[PDB]
């Protein structure tokens, strides 16, 4: 019995008991989320503790199979995903300290409030209050006050805490046969063992840098356009040759620019296309939206979903009683049980997110045949890419006319798709520089290039250099502005979104190129095209079994990240932006200072 032949028996018992302990844990989590009650929380906690104990025991037992004697690629991948030491490499006291500091970071980000304005009687919670006050506001003073208050209340309490968290995570990564925590995070965009399709973390860094370098002009033109629009909206607040203040970038974090569409309408005389009125006029229920989405998926070529998806999964708000969480999530329980947890409303956004989660569900069914440890996207950027190509295909006006919701008498003029492209760019290309800047800053902080005593200055200088937004007020070294982000404070990788966009646009371009479509890229539709469905399903069924450098080529044709599909997707928008900012300044400079 060779090592590769005993590896396979251990991995088989792991697969069986792990599938049982996940359907148990996932069912408990679903029961909690659908019905929040003390016994539900206790049951979910017990199931999670059992699952974590089983994972720890199996990880300890899997250390006896070295990877040097393993020849099969799938078995090697499963063992690599199972042999990770994780946070158990630290000392018991250090591990407990790390868990406690992560927990208090999460609980202080979640429970943070802004009682600074006026009297402490009105404590503005972040989720209902801060997002609402940052989505729309015509006063500079209130936005600046809220932004500064939140940033101060976060940094002044989490600066030493974040330093301790960084030190502990760096020590864990170093003890985990790695270089730093950024290297540990990048250790998932890594392929080694097969010739021709290989990847490295340094290769990932170089690829991200090159993609951003070749994507810079489009984002620069968009930034100039939005700066001019805000100058028109805001008198005497921005410099003609300087970066615009960060706190006006729609969302407070500046991650998404979707909220700036109100002040940046290319054509106010032509309203954006909406389906809410036609949907309520047709008396569409929460079930009909999913029925039509499933019909679209079947027309593409993907299979139907079982009655267990309809009877078990809940799609409507359960009323005042049985409180739940309205976070649209696609659940893969583990054993033929696929559910979506969302409160479907009669809106365009809910209609599109139904397809977005339904695509994740289709991905789950596609890779359900793979072993337990290979039931994921080839990297973290595949699931959301598939969901987003589903949303893009489902949002095309021709698909809306085909589904019968839109009136066939409606006509398309350049203003319509130019507004659609601007909205897509504000949603998509406006989050790439921010994601890249944040991930680079975290990578260099964990690596050690950025000194601990100099964090805020370098972060803001990077913000000027890459994103291009100035500080509304100078910040000293006793601040932890990046920690205000949910992903940074909760120990989450952020390159997922950059990778997601750069994969989704390649996927859409390749799929609709194989659908025999002639015309603009933004009007591409996968509906009623079995060839594109088969081409996508070939990659979908792979899961994490084969390297992402191969799965990307299997559907697109290239083994690396690309920007040309993203660039020519916004090609009409690119020409319009070029023709717009003629007399206005091009580019931003760091010479601006208050």
């Amino acid at each position: 019995s060779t090592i590769e032949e005993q590896a396979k028996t251990f991995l088989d018992k792991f697969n069986h008991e792990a599938e049982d302990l996940f359907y148990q844990s996932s069912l408990a989590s679903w029961n909690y989320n659908t019905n929040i009650t003390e016994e539900n929380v206790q049951n979910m906690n017990n199931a999670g503790d059992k699952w974590s104990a089983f994972l720890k025991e199996q990880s300890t037992l899997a250390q006896m199979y070295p990877l040097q004697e393993i020849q099969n690629l799938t078995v090697k991948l499963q063992l690599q995903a199972l042999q990770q030491n994780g946070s158990s490499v630290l000392s018991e006291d250090k591990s407990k300290r790390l868990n406690t500091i992560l927990n208090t970071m999460s609980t202080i980000y979640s429970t943070g409030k802004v009682c600074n304005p006026d009297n402490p009687q009105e404590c503005l919670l972040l989720e209902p209050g801060l997002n609402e006050i940052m989505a729309n506001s015509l006063d500079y003073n209130e936005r600046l006050w809220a932004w500064e208050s939140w940033r101060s209340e976060v940094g002044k309490q989490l600066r030493p805490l974040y330093e301790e968290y960084v030190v502990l995570k760096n020590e864990m990564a170093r003890a985990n046969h790695y270089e730093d925590y950024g290297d540990y995070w990048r250790g998932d965009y890594e392929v080694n063992g097969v010739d021709g399709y290989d990847y490295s973390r340094g290769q990932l860094i170089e690829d991200v840098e090159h993609t951003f370098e070749e994507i810079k002009p489009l984002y620069e033109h968009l930034h100039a356009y939005v700066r001019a629009k805000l100058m028109n909206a805001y008198p005497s607040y921005i410099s003609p040759i300087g970066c615009l203040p960060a706190h006006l970038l729609g969302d407070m974090w500046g991650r998404f620019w979707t909220n700036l569409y109100s002040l940046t309408v290319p054509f106010g005389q032509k309203p954006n296309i909406d389906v809410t009125d036609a949907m309520v006029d047709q008396a569409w229920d929460a079930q009909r939206i999913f029925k039509e989405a499933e019909k679209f998926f079947v027309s593409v070529g993907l299979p139907n979903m079982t009655q267990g998806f309809w009877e078990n999964s809940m799609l409507t708000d359960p009323g005042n009683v049985q409180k739940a969480v309205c976070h649209p999530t696609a659940w893969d329980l583990g054993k033929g049980d696929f559910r979506i947890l969302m409160c479907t409303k009669v809106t365009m956004d809910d209609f599109l997110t139904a397809h977005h989660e339904m695509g994740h569900i289709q991905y789950d069914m596609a890779y359900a045949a793979q072993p337990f440890l290979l039931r994921n996207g080839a990297n973290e950027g595949f699931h959301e890419a598939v969901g987003e190509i589903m949303s893009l295909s489902a949002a095309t006006p021709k698909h809306l006319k085909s589904i019968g919701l839109l009136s066939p008498d409606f006509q398309e003029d350049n203003e319509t798709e130019i507004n659609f492209l601007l909205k897509q760019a504000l949603t998509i290309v406006g989050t790439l520089p921010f994601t890249y800047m944040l991930e680079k800053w975290r990578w260099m902080v964990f690596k050690g290039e950025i000194p601990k005593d100099q964090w805020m200055k370098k972060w803001w200088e990077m913000k000027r250099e890459i994103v291009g937004v100035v500080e509304p007020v100078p910040h000293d070294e006793t601040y932890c502005d990046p920690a205000s982000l949910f992903h940074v404070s909760n120990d989450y990788s952020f390159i997922r979104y950059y990778t997601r966009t750069l994969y989704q646009f390649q996927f859409q371009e390749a799929l609709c190129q194989a659908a025999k479509h002639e015309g603009p890229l933004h009007k591409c539709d996968i509906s009623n095209s079995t060839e594109a469905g088969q081409k996508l399903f070939n990659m979908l069924r792979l899961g994490k079994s084969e390297p992402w450098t191969l799965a990307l080529e299997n559907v697109v044709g290239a083994k690396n990240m690309n920007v040309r599909p993203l660039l020519n997707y916004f090609e009409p928008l690119f020409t319009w932006l070029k023709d717009q900012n003629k007399n206005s300044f091009v580019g931003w400079s760091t010479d601006w200072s208050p």
């Binding site: 019995s1 005993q6 028996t9 251990f10 088989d12 018992k13 069986h16 049982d20 359907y23 148990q24 069912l27 037992l61 006896m64 079982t306 009655q307 267990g308 998806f309 078990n312 329980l333 054993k335 033929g336 049980d337 696929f338």
Partner: protein, 193 residues
Amino acid sequence: NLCPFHEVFNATRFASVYAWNRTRISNCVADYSVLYNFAPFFAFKCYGVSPTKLNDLCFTNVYADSFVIKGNEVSQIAPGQTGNIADYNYKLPDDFTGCVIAWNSNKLDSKHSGNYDYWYRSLRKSKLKPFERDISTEIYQAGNKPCKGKGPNCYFPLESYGFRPTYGVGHQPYRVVVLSFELLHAPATVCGP
């Protein structure tokens, strides 16, 4: 006489795929219409004797095996098939002249909290020859060291089929009842008009 087809099909409890149940049926009159008027089945792919000629032949001995498996593993109940059920649990001969009946039974074979009363053998030193039953809960020695009772490289062979009503089609219990028709040189015993 009336063959005990109903008792085989109406049994309150069904066996596990590793310890499946065999019931020889003879000295009676075949009634396959009664078999038809039982339930709308999920599979009736029955190799060898055609269903039309079922009431037109005389098979010496009728064997009615019965067990509970998943929905995916019903396709492994057929000649020349491979898998955990067709190599260690229940293997059919290549010259299989009988009918494999298999309906869905998640209504009765689920407990909403894990119906671990149904087991299946996932590890075995050697494959299973046709129509062979092996019930031995001896720990399987995957490693190169003698087994002292569980621990590393010593796994319990039989793995339970944790059944729940919320499982999708394919993981729900499926009460499979094959109906083999063996023939010998002895005078015909089972005949039906």
